[PDB]
């Protein structure tokens, strides 16, 4: 707000409102939100699977 720092190097998700208030530069990285879940767990019935 005081323009103390002319730059802010960080992962800056350039949203429409953020671009409206801070005219951000071109995105160095193109990324997106992704889903997270637990790895599958294999409860095998053993060698005697039958």
């Amino acid at each position: 707000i005081d323009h103390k720092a002319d730059l802010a190097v960080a992962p800056l998700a350039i949203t429409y409102v953020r671009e409206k208030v801070i005219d951000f530069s071109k995105p160095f990285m193109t990324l997106g939100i992704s889903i997270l879940y637990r790895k599958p767990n294999g409860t095998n019935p053993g060698v005697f699977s039958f």
Binding site: L7, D23, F24, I33, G46, V47
Partner: protein, 209 residues
């Protein structure tokens, strides 16, 4: 001795029929259920926990989202902020690790975490429109200088190594990605072991006498 032979024949036929039917039922019911959750779709489930952090960037994106694949999720997690919504990213990661929970931040964070721990999985990606870059409060030329420097940085090959070395961590163990319907080695080896044991006992009792 024809009647006893016939009844034994029908007995074996019906027993093997029941065995085949029950085994086939087990295989069909396990395969019909998707081993993973629907790709980038936690909808139509409302049982497995899902959400993101409280008032995070993902929360901002999906709060103002009216798509039925997303608006229902947003309404449910806003109704259940006390349970399905966490405060910090690591808290959500731990909640996923301890119990079935779906978590939703930037793909880079998710892949970094799953490299740091192979106990959690990733399914989809790029379900949100955003880009990462440097910031400039005003209409300055130095932001243009940084952008052109970045663009000339991609045109040459240096970004890949520096990008990956940050997210390398420990070596990721090799894990399957395109498994087919064929039975596993452990899934069939039991009958091999049983047949081998029967054969060796038969050979031993034959050579004993």
């Amino acid at each position: 001795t024809r009647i006893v032979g016939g009844i034994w024949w029908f007995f074996t036929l019906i027993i093997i029929s029941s065995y085949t039917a029950n085994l086939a039922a087990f295989l069909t019911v396990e395969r019909m259920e998707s081993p993973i959750d629907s790709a980038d779709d936690l909808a139509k489930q409302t049982k497995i926990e899902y959400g993101a952090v409280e008032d995070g960037a993902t929360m901002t994106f999906f709060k103002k989202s009216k798509i039925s694949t997303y608006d229902k999720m947003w309404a449910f997690m806003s109704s259940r902020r006390q349970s399905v919504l966490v405060k910090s990213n690591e808290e959500g990661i731990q909640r996923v690790l301890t119990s079935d929970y779906a978590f939703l931040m930037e793909s880079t964070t998710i892949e970094f975490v799953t490299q740091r721990n192979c106990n959690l999985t990733q399914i989809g990606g790029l379900i949100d429109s955003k880009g990462y870059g440097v910031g400039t409060p005003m209409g300055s030329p130095y932001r243009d200088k940084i952008t052109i420097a970045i663009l000339q940085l991609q045109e040459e090959g240096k970004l890949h190594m520096m990008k990956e070395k940050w997210w390398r961590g420990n070596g990721c163990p090799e894990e399957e990605s395109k498994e087919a319907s064929a039975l596993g080695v452990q899934n069939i080896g039991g009958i091999f072991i049983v047949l081998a044991a029967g054969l060796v006992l038969s050979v031993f009792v034959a050579v004993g006498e």
